[PDB]
Write a protein that binds this DNA or RNA. Sequence first.
DNA 1: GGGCCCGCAGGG
DNA 2: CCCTGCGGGCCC
Length: 204
Amino acid sequence: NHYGPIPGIPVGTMWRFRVQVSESGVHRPHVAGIHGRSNDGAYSLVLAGGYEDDVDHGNFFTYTGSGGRDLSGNKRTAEQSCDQKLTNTNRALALNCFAPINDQEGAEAKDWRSGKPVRVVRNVKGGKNSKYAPAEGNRYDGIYKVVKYWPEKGKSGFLVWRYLLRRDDDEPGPWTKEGKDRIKKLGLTMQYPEGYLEALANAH
DNA sequence: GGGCCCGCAGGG
DNA sequence: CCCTGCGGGCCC
């Protein structure tokens, strides 16, 4: 539903599980990387190193579309086994870009800052191929905007949709000096589900 | 009512 | 250690 930050949830907020990010409003889907409607646009997305074509550079990153995958056998993830399409959440994210939607060669917003805002969450699994992933769980990293998107062959050899997102947010990134100071001042700390830690105090 | 899914953990 | 496939929410 909502575009932009969630009122009163500062950049640097951390949650241990995806479900907690969801109940916060920050990223509603419990599994999916993109939260979006195909005739409106995308509200939030997660970098979790789930797609090999994701490259994260912090203040900007190239995100991969979802799909191009065989999820037979009641799967949630798989390797690329066919071309992605500009449909569903992929189409949603493309609409955020401040340029006419083109599903053949993609598009670029000259005035990208005028595009729709995307809430961006970074998850620890993104750490294999990124300097910007938190050490644990999920972290709210602020607002980014889609500069451009285009199709190309991924590492797998199949077509993927690729999106350049660039940061556009007055709250500083949590990996920066000021981001770290703010987090410290606010006392931001990993949020666990209720009862979770107690259940872990059950090592015997 | 069916599709989708950047998680997660039980059980091998 | 590695593997399998479940709920449930949200979309359409």
